[PDB]
Amino acid sequence: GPKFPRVKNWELGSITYDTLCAQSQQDGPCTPRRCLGSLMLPPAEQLLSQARDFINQYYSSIKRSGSQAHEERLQEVEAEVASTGTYHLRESELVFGAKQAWRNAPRCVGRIQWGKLQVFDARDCSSAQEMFTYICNHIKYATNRGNLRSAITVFPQRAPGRGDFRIWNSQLVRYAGYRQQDGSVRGDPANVEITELCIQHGWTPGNGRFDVLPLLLQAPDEAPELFVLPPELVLEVPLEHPTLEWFAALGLRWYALPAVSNMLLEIGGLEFSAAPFSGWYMSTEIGTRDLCDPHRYNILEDVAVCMDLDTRTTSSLWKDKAAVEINLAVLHSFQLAKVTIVDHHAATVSFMKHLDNEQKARGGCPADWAWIVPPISGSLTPVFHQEMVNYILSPAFRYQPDPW
Amino acid sequence: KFPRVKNWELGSITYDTLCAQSQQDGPCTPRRCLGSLMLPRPAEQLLSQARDFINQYYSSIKRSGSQAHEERLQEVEAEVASTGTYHLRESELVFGAKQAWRNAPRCVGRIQWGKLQVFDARDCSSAQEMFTYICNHIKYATNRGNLRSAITVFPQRAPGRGDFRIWNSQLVRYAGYRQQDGSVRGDPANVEITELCIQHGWTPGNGRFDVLPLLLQAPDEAPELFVLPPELVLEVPLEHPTLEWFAALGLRWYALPAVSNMLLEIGGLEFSAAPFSGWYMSTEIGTRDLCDPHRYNILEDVAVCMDLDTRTTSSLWKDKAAVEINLAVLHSFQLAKVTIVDHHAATVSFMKHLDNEQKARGGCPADWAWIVPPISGSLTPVFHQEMVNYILSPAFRYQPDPW
Ligand code: HEM
Ligand code: HEM
Ligand SMILES: Cc1cc(N)nc(CCc2cccc(CCc3cc(C)nc(N)c3)c2)c1
Ligand SMILES: Cc1cc(N)nc(CCc2cccc(CCc3cc(C)nc(N)c3)c2)c1
Ligand SMILES: C[C@H](O)[C@H](O)[C@H]1CNc2nc(N)[nH]c(=O)c2N1
Ligand SMILES: C[C@H](O)[C@H](O)[C@H]1CNc2nc(N)[nH]c(=O)c2N1
Ligand SMILES: [Zn+2]
């Protein structure tokens, strides 16, 4: 009967309909002919309608839709575009749009926390040193000595024919990737290019598997300036296993604060090219993807050898065994170091709770199944059995071209 | 318009040009992707589908545009033109069924698509006959543990009349008995089909692994009930290579995975009963069938057996027990000398399959959420491979339950 997508949970046998998708004003990659769900990467009038939509969302969200303060703000926005081509957000509109952006992000399993985000307004920032300061305050606040708090620092928006504010690094904390003159990679192979870029702008490079990179920060129309994070601010966790005593001797570690810095925050048309945000990790990001991907640290074989497994064949399930212990080592060490982390079971459960809230509040929740299901123990988590609708709402986070 | 398909482990890129051959729409639109849903909710069409298929056949055997090619297109026009339908020649049928497997976007086993034994059962007029055919297929496919893939094609659907159907969703299935307190004894997925069996006069067991009888239906007749001779149903008692206690759980699973509720479409013809079988990939037994909360749900028990900390999700008791259960399965199948494939070997081989398909056809429809195993996904190479999904024909479809 209802002509909205029917959404089923195959474990519990329950059924919903996503009506929220009707609100989507941007096309994704799929068509009736073929599904492109698994791919990672798929102006006056145009700006004004995006701005009107957002202001409408704002007033809705405080329950004053249609009111004269709503029609006045609408008027104020169109007046400001009329004469300058852009406009600006009130403080509390930025706070709402930034949260709304996290809320709308289809690939984030952490959304249950969407309403608990600290928004640092940094639209006054006018230099690269100042960005540094702002970022340090961020890390300091967000890190909070282990008791991690979600936050986002918002720098000034794209302006017409004026350079963007850009953080070159893809995350605020990143280990160096040193290309060897024997093809291989020392450190994190994900970070090869940014390392090369830092060195070229005059960083004296280290030599280790876990060297914290400096920040490359770009004020409008200036070459990027290089900034070393003072070590005492970058909280790391040494990794050790609860029962395998030799795991500590591997000298593996990860940093506490996952802070993404290369995304664009789009709110009602306006684009914030430098709006770094952070939360806390899910255990599989480090334990499974970062440490075990063949194209990352790739420690799987090393660990299984230590665990004395048969690596000559697949049917020993040697990879599955080691993956689990590496993950268990991530959880145990973070717990021991009193640093916030969430395991993939706890995390997905809370995402199911989120789906139920959003069903009630908005009529659905855009979700990307391939990304919400964790990279180990998929069907062991309730999300695997949950059909999901994926679509682009706004405000949003967006990828953007690398500044170089 | 041609999708760029990337492998993020190796950084290699291809292009799907095979998706341009799709003639049937999927559930996605530009507005929203519905790729994670399980079910998707006359003389000119049949004639053109028919044509396209016959072409696929002659081109397949390189005789395209030739003598027997034009003259077979005539046989088909003639036959539809005057009877509103037509019939397939055995070899064309053999080709269609191989191709429907090849086109199956959710199948990880397609490296094998060319090795398929095809039984023509189109001369069947009775559930009786259907059964005899069903037993031959089982005997053949099972081959004393050395599983061989097979399909058995019963007569096509027909305008005037009811379908030949096999009511059971698989050929071998364990009973599910809904007990006093809304509990379930045995396989919870087969409560409905156990109930139907009981309605049509089957005396039920009361164990956890009671092989169900088959309900087979010939057109417009009530279904009939047939009991598989226990010797034709090869079963593997599960044990663990190091945990001596695991066998005491009394767990087991059947060797032959043979699907029987799926419709086979070839050149616009529909085959409502065409059971097919190959061999299990281990995660199906070890992870979905035994650990799914709405299946046998053995995860907690194993874990307690393993003296693991059940109190908390962070001890990874779920993941640990799951690995050992999947191990017990491979060990057991290996010990009983019955074909099985782990999810590492399977996906490795599927990768090779995408490579052949790339050279051979310009693409391969695949369904990322089904190709990636239910545990240890990113530990397998398919996890890092982008994939295009779309519907090619010949095809397997779902069809409504006949009751
Ligand atoms: C609070 C704890 C959080 C957890 C556990 C969490 C978890 C995750 C995970 C596991 C992913 C998939 C990442 C990957 O595998 O690469 C993700 C994606 C994402 N996260 Fe969250 N997150 C959290 C907080 C946040 C915050 C504070 C924001 C921003 C305000 C955020 C925004 C996003 C966005 C936009 C994506 C999509 C990335 C993409 O589109 O490629 N998350 N998150
Ligand atoms: C021979 C070894 C085979 C292996 C290892 C294998 C493996 C699998 C697996 C793991 C699935 C996912 C389904 C699930 O988890 O429920 C699947 C799906 C499928 N398989 Fe295969 N399979 C094999 C043979 C065959 C054969 C012989 C056929 C038919 C000729 C076939 C046709 C299909 C189809 C049509 C699907 C998709 C079902 C759907 O859309 O729900 N497979 N296969
Ligand atoms: C806040 C946060 C929490 C968490 N648990 N993990 C992370 C790290 C995972 C994460 C989250 C968002 C965004 C990204 C990457 C964004 C990104 C950007 C570009 C340009 N290309 C890509 N392929 C990807 C990664 C971040
Ligand atoms: C040949 C084969 C090999 C293998 N390893 N596993 C299987 C079993 C998995 C499998 C494959 C295709 C099709 C199904 C049917 C799933 C299914 C689908 C619908 C709509 N209703 C149901 N009751 C059941 C199941 C079959
Ligand atoms: C091809 C595939 O979409 C790609 O590897 C995706 C799969 N799911 C993912 N899910 C998360 N959370 N992160 C990822 O990087 C990926 N990779
Ligand atoms: C809703 C979700 O798509 C559903 O649980 C799917 C996910 N992936 C799967 N993958 C396989 N191979 N088999 C399945 O039954 C499923 N179930
Ligand atoms: Zn799609």
Residues in B closer than 8 angstroms to A376, CB to CB, are: 319, 375-379
A118 touches chain B (CB under 8 A): no
Which residues have beta carbons under 5 A from ligand 7 (an ion)?
A 30, 35, 37; B 28, 33, 35
**3-state secondary structure (DSSP) of residue A344:** helix
Count of CB atoms situated within 10 Å of the CB of A122: 23
Instruction: Answer yes or no: same fold for A124-149+164-235+399-403 and A236-258+281-346.
Output: no
State whether A317 and B326 contact (CB < 8 Å).
Answer: yes
Question: Per-residue DSSP letters for B141-153?
Answer: HHGGG----EEEE
Biggest alpha carbon–alpha carbon distance for chain B: 73
Strand partners, B5: B14
Whether B181 and B220 have beta carbons less than 8 Å apart is answered as: no
Residue among B29, B320, B369 minimizing CB distance to A370: B369
Location of structure tokens 């660990």: A303
**Interatomic CA distance for residues A33 and A25, integer angstroms:** 21
**Interatomic CA distance for residues A323 and A286, integer angstroms:** 11
Whether B106 and B371 have beta carbons less than 8 Å apart is answered as: yes
Among B residues 38-77, those touching chain A with beta carbons less than 8 Å apart: 38, 41
Spatial strand order in the sheet of A151-154:
A118-121, A151-154, A277-278, A259-260
Resolution (A): 2.5
Whether B224 and B217 have beta carbons less than 8 Å apart is answered as: yes
Q: Which residue of A has its CA nearest to B341?
A: A315
B16-122+149-159+263-277+347-371: CATH class: alpha beta
Closest residue CA from atom 18 of ligand 2: B107
Q: Report the topology of domain B123-148+163-234+398-402.
A: Nitric Oxide Synthase;Heme Domain; Chain A, domain 2 (3.90.440)
**3-state secondary structure (DSSP) of residue A178:** strand
CA atoms within 13 A on the CB side of A331: 22
Return the structure tokens found at B79.
């036959």
- H-assigned helices in A201-296: 283-284, 291-292
Whether A314 and B344 have beta carbons less than 8 Å apart is answered as: yes
Amino acid letter for position B227: V
Residue B143's contacts (CB-CB under 8 Å, 6 or more residues apart) are none
Whether A320 and A312 have beta carbons less than 8 Å apart is answered as: no
Residue B72's contacts (CB-CB under 8 Å, 6 or more residues apart) are B54, B58, B89
Residues near ligand 1 (Cβ within 6 A): A 102, 105, 107-110, 113, 117, 150, 152, 277, 279-280, 282, 285, 342, 347, 371, 397
A236-258+281-346: CATH class: alpha beta
| A331 Cα–ligand 3 center, Å | 20
For ligand 5, is residue B386 a contact (CB within 6 Å)?
yes
Residues in A closer than 8 angstroms to B5, CB to CB, are: 39
A389 touches chain B (CB under 8 A): yes
Location of structure tokens 């969200």: A61
Closest by Cα among A217, A205, A221, A206 to A136? A217
Q: What was the elucidation method?
A: X-ray
A378 touches chain B (CB under 8 A): yes
Residues in A closer than 8 angstroms to B41, CB to CB, are: 6
Q: In Å, what is the CA distance from A261 to each residue of A31, A276, A398, B243? A: 31, 4, 11, 48
Amino acid letter for position A260: V
B235-257+280-345: CATH class: alpha beta
Q: In Å, what is the CA distance from A75 to each residue of A55, A68, A72, A79, B38? A: 11, 10, 5, 6, 47
Q: Report the topology of domain A18-123+150-160+264-278+348-372.
A: Nitric Oxide Synthase; Chain A, domain 1 (3.90.340)
Q: Could you identify the atom of ligand 3 that is nearest to the CA of residue A282?
A: 5
**Interatomic CA distance for residues A396 and A390, integer angstroms:** 14
State whether B25 and A39 contact (CB < 8 Å).
Answer: no
Q: In Å, what is the CA distance from A5 to each residue of A203, B12, B34? A: 52, 35, 8
State whether B36 and A369 contact (CB < 8 Å).
Answer: yes
Biggest alpha carbon–alpha carbon distance for chain A: 73
**Interatomic CA distance for residues A215 and A196, integer angstroms:** 13
Whether B171 and B193 have beta carbons less than 8 Å apart is answered as: no
Residues in A closer than 8 angstroms to B315, CB to CB, are: 328
**Interatomic CA distance for residues A284 and A307, integer angstroms:** 20
Domains of chain B, by residue range, sit at: 16-122+149-159+263-277+347-371, 123-148+163-234+398-402, 235-257+280-345
Q: In Å, what is the CA distance from A82 to each residue of A44, A47, A76, A79, A87? A: 8, 11, 10, 5, 9
**Whether domain A124-149+164-235+399-403 has CATH 3.90.440.10:** yes
State whether A28 and B26 contact (CB < 8 Å).
Answer: no
